[PDB]
Amino acid sequence: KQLRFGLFENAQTNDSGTATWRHPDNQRHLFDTLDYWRNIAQICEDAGLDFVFLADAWGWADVNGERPDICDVEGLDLPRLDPAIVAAALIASTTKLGLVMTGSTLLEQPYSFARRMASLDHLSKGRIGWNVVTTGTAETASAAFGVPMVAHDDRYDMADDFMELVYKLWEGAWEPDALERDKQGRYADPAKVHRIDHEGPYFRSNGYGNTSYSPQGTPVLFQAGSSERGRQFGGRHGECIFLGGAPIPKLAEQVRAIRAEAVAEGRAADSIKLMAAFSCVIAPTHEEAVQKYQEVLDSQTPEVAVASYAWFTGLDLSSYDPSTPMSELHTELSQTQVARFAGLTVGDVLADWHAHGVRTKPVVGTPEEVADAIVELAEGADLDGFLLTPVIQPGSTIDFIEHVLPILRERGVAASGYDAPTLRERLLGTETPVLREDHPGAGYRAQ
Amino acid sequence: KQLRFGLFENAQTNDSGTATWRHPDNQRHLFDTLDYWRNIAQICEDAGLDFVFLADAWGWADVNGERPDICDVEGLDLPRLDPAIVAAALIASTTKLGLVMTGSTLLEQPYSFARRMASLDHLSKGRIGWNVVTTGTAETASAAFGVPMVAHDDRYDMADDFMELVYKLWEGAWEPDALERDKQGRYADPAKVHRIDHEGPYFRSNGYGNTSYSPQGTPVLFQAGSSERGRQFGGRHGECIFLGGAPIPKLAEQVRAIRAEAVAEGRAADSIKLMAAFSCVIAPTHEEAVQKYQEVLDSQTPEVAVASYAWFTGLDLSSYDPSTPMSELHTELSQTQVARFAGLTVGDVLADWHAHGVRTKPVVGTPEEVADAIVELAEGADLDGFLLTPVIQPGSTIDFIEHVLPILRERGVAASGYDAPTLRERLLGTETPVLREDHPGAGYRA
Numbered sequence: 001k002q003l004r005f006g007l008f009e010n011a012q013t014n015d016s017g018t019a020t021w022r023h024p025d026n027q028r029h030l031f032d033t034l035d036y037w038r039n040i041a042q043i044c045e046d047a048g049l050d051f052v053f054l055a056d057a058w059g060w061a062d063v064n065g066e067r068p069d070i071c072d073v074e075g076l077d078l079p080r081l082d083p084a085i086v087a088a089a090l091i092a093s094t095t096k097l098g099l100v101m102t103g104s105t106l107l108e109q110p111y112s113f114a115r116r117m118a119s120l121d122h123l124s125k126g127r128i129g130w131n132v133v134t135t136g137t138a139e140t141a142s143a144a145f146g147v148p149m150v151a152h153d154d155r156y157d158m159a160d161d162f163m164e165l166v167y168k169l170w171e172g173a174w175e176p177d178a179l180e181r182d183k184q185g186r187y188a189d190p191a192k193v194h195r196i197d198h199e200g201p202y203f204r205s206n207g208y209g210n211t212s213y214s215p216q217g218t219p220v221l222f223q224a225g226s227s228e229r230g231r232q233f234g235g236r237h238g239e240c241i242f243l244g245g246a247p248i249p250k251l252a253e254q255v256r257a258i259r260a261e262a263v264a265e266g267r268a269a270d271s272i273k274l275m276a277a278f279s280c281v282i283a284p285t286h287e288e289a290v291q292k293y294q295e296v297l298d299s300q301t302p303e304v305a306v307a308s309y310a311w312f313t314g315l316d317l318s319s320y321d322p323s324t325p326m327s328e329l330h331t332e333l334s335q336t337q338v339a340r341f342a343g344l345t346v347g348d349v350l351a352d353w354h355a356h357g358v359r360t361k362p363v364v365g366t367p368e369e370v371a372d373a374i375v376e377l378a379e380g381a382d383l384d385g386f387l388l389t390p391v392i393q394p395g396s397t398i399d400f401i402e403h404v405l406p407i408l409r410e411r412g413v414a415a416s417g418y419d420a421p422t423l424r425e426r427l428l429g430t431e432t433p434v435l436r437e438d439h440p441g442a443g444y445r446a447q
Numbered sequence: 448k449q450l451r452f453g454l455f456e457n458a459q460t461n462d463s464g465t466a467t468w469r470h471p472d473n474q475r476h477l478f479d480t481l482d483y484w485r486n487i488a489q490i491c492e493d494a495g496l497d498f499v500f501l502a503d504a505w506g507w508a509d510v511n512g513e514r515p516d517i518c519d520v521e522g523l524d525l526p527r528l529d530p531a532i533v534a535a536a537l538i539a540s541t542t543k544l545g546l547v548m549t550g551s552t553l554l555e556q557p558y559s560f561a562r563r564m565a566s567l568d569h570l571s572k573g574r575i576g577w578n579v580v581t582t583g584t585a586e587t588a589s590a591a592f593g594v595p596m597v598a599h600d601d602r603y604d605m606a607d608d609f610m611e612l613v614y615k616l617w618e619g620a621w622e623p624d625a626l627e628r629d630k631q632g633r634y635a636d637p638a639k640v641h642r643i644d645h646e647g648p649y650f651r652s653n654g655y656g657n658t659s660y661s662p663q664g665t666p667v668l669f670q671a672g673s674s675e676r677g678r679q680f681g682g683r684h685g686e687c688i689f690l691g692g693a694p695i696p697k698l699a700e701q702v703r704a705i706r707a708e709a710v711a712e713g714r715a716a717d718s719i720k721l722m723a724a725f726s727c728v729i730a731p732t733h734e735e736a737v738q739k740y741q742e743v744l745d746s747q748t749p750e751v752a753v754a755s756y757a758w759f760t761g762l763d764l765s766s767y768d769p770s771t772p773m774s775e776l777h778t779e780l781s782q783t784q785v786a787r788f789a790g791l792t793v794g795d796v797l798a799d800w801h802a803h804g805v806r807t808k809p810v811v812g813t814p815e816e817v818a819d820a821i822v823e824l825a826e827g828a829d830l831d832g833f834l835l836t837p838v839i840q841p842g843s844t845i846d847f848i849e850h851v852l853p854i855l856r857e858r859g860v861a862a863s864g865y866d867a868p869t870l871r872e873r874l875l876g877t878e879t880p881v882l883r884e885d886h887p888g889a890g891y892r893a
């Protein structure tokens with residue numbers, strides 16, 4: 001079984017509720033420069049990584065109504081760039097690397113979003129993916145857009161409606177062979193260009209779509225959101241499911257449950273790909289790697305913890321008795337960030353939240369030790385790939401590529417290069433760039 | 448006086464309601480490939496053109512209630528790409544060229560639009576502009592987005608509110624020096640990062656902005672829309688006003704009116720820039736140029752006229768007797784495409800609409816003839832610049848660059864190369880990349 005590998009990034013200085021930016025070798029304070037992204041993309045493409053993945057957020061770290069000063073002192077949450085713009089710039093600098101961007105069904109307008117993603121897919125020749133999210137910063141983000149807040153599960157219902165409309169725009173509006181471009185004949189076959197009609201609980205659309213059928217039709221659908229309602233949503237729509245890290249027995253059960261959701265939705269159990277976040281700290285000896293990790297931790301101040309947690313949950317941990325069990329608390333925002341701490345207390349969470357944030361504890365050791373841990377995770381949890389989540393950039397990515405990936409390639413668990421030209425062919429193993437017939441999006445094709 | 452020059456383009460096969468795509472040398476059927484745009488951008492940047500301009504449209508040519516099949520046979524209105532994506536891809540392939548993209552105040556969300564434009568400005572190091580439109584295809588576009596239609600003058604009221612909000616996001620949310628990025632100090636100064644508050648008739652926003660202060664702060668504000676209400680809007684907000692072609696005395700009156708609008712808003716009269724569309728066919732002799740233009744007209748079927756005109760006005764010209772004068776027709780869409788023919792009749796412009804659409808006839812002649820026409824227009828109408836509107840691509844652009852631009856440079860009416868690194872410095876002559884202190888957007892700074 002050949003695993004897929006992508007790089008997790010985001011267009012801001014820090015990520016995932018941590019703040020490693022002060023580490024001497026970290027360079028992502030340059031995230032607002034194109035040279036930073038050109039460098040990252042060239043590193044990944046030269047190595048043959050399947051894709052670079054851009055996370056996104058729309059809101060900010062509001063604590064009990066205001067944003068504490070530490071958020072600016074540490075660049076915790078803001079400022080950021082728009083992922084679609086970063087992705088479009090990286091198209092021009094790459095030829096084979098996949099580009100996956102996070103996009104919110106809560107805050108995008110589906111008609112404009114459909115045109116934007118199809119434009120990226122046209123210009124990149126089918127290298128685009130979309131990580132479907134319902135936005136974990138939903139409360140502040142709604143305020144910034146001037147619209148009422150939408151509850152957690154309703155955002156997944158709204159996302160269902162969002163998907164049906166973009167499926168119509170991407171798959172039903174223009175048939176794949178509509179464009180003929182024959183100067184002696186027809187530019188397009190009118191019989192293959194259709195008005196679409198959509199009247200859902202959240203979205204309405206009537207008319208033609210702006211973009212013609214793109215190389216992949218629909219961008220590769222990533223999905224990140226491992227709440228119960230999110231797992232149902234990913235089991236229905238997601239082609240590649242991004243999972244946070246966890247002990248192998250817990251990760252195996254999550255993978256099993258998500259494959260069973262896909263089966264209950266009429267999809268083949270193997271037609272959905274499960275990819276785990278994976279962070280690592282690599283050094284020539286195990287003791288050196290442990291020390292390297294200590295230096296990363298030493299750069300992070302604990303004072304970010306409360307605002308960081310409030311950024312994703314709206315919960316102010318500093319206002320409860322630290323013995324309060326997390327099982328008693330609820331959020332309409334990032335529900336996995338509460339549910340993952342069931343059994344623990346508020347004081348437990350607040351004790352080392354700053355160290356990992358929403359992220360996973362790293363695997364720390366020699367290159368062989370880290371490669372062994374990747375294989376153990378993939379076999380033990382039935383995973384299809386990994387998104388490398390760096391602790392500092394570009395060092396964490398360079399270290400993995402230079403020292404761990406070659407062992408994985410020699411063991412035959414990582415491919416040596418770019419076999420297929422589109423992201424879907426590469427990730428899903430199809431020999432067609434378009435959605436499988438047992439995917440919901442296929443049902444909206446002109447038949 | 449040094450004139451500025453940009454290239455008008457759009458991310459679709461044809462433009463402006465005409466359809467020249469069948470000409471053997473036309474390449475814009477490749478608009479959905481990045482290589483097409485790389486070539487255009489390289490041609491413009493090698494020549495030192497100030498910018499490439501991307502128009503936009505959201506709607507389509509609805510005649511009565513649907514799209515005649517001639518729209519697909521001729522690729523008249525669809526398909527197209529998103530201009531921001533094209534612009535971002537061209538950022539990476541260029542270093543000094545300006546990139547101006549059309550964006551709709553009717554259908555964009557200001558908060559996400561502000562983040563998008565500022566991201567383009569950061570990544571391009573201050574080379575981005577925004578052409579503010581209220582969408583001339585508003586009826587179909589509104590149905591596509593599932594939103595109720597907004598009447599013509601109300602769309603400019605909505606644009607006013609849109610502008611105030613994005614000014615707050617671009618100028619007032621993060622002070623220009625907020626970021627320090629000092630690993631032994633602070634990442635940012637909390638006293639220079641501000642919560643903004645906005646409550647308007649059309650938009651609302653409360654909270655922080657996503658993007659820090661970008662190199663120009665606000666993209667260079669182009670504005671296109673020459674109705675009376677649009678001239679008032681441009682006079683307040685626009686830094687570079689895009690005007691359609693017209694006879695010199697009519698263009699001159701428009702320039703005069705728009706500068707008076709700017710003065711009324713507390714701006715200096717010279718500080719708003721007026722740039723006219725200009726199309727031309729160039730050849731070594733006049734007779735060669737006439738024949739070269741005729742070979743273009745030969746590829747344009749008149750059958751698109753009804754759909755093309757309906758695309759911009761919602762009006763079906765074949766549904767009137769030709770004797771009906773245009774002065775009796777009215778639209779809530781592209782009102783200038785109705786007002787420009789006041790005094791003619793339906794049958795008059797139905798007969799020639801396919802030739803030029805929303806544009807005007809090209810100047811056809813030798814390089815010396817075309818350069819003379821450029822100078823006579825700029826002097827007579829008090830213009831600051833031109834946007835070349837090609838007839839075919841890349842041929843019309845190359846011809847202008849290789850044969851007319853050298854004359855203009857030798858005469859001293861065009862600069863020889865790139866003088867300044869940001870688009871606002873190059874077009875407005877400011878001392879720094881940010882808005883003039885007498886522009887309304889500067890009032891929203893902290």
Ligand SMILES: Cc1cc2nc3c(=O)[nH]c(=O)nc-3n(C[C@H](O)[C@H](OP(=O)(O)O)[C@H](O)CO)c2cc1C
Pocket residue numbers: 054055056057102133134135136137138155224225226227228229230231242243244277333334335336337
């Ligand atoms: C690995 C990974 C990455 C994620 N990245 C993002 C992101 O970049 N932006 C986002 O809004 N939501 C992301 N999420 C989703 C949140 O956890 C959350 O889902 P859920 O846990 O509530 O189902 C939604 O934002 C809630 O609206 C991610 C989830 C996972 C598992």
Ligand SMILES: Cc1cc2nc3c(=O)[nH]c(=O)nc-3n(C[C@H](O)[C@H](OP(=O)(O)O)[C@H](O)CO)c2cc1C
Pocket residue numbers: 502503504549580581582583584585602671672673674675676677689690691724780781782783784
């Ligand atoms: C030279 C040039 C170019 C224009 N380009 C566009 C465009 O690309 N997209 C657009 O929606 N509206 C463009 N317009 C504006 C339309 O004429 C029209 O303005 P107005 O004439 O009614 O004031 C608005 O679309 C109405 O909503 C342009 C106007 C001019 C003068």
Ligand SMILES: Cc1cc2nc3c(=O)[nH]c(=O)nc-3n(C[C@H](O)[C@H](O)[C@H](O)CO)c2cc1C
Pocket residue numbers: 008010011014015016017055056057135136137243244245277312334336337358359360389
């Ligand atoms: C393992 C992992 C888990 C994540 N969980 C969340 C989450 O629960 N909510 C959220 O908004 N973002 C989540 N993210 C996205 C992350 O916080 C990202 O840096 C921000 O969204 C800024 O782009 C997660 C990212 C990773 C790598």
Ligand SMILES: Cc1cc2nc3c(=O)[nH]c(=O)nc-3n(C[C@H](O)[C@H](O)[C@H](O)CO)c2cc1C
Pocket residue numbers: 455457458461462463464502503504582583584690691692724759781783784805806807836
């Ligand atoms: C001189 C000139 C005038 C234009 N007038 C309009 C207009 O009135 N309405 C409109 O929607 N677009 C107008 N455009 C934009 C043009 O139709 C563009 O090709 C389409 O919007 C597709 O991007 C104009 C463009 C030029 C160069």
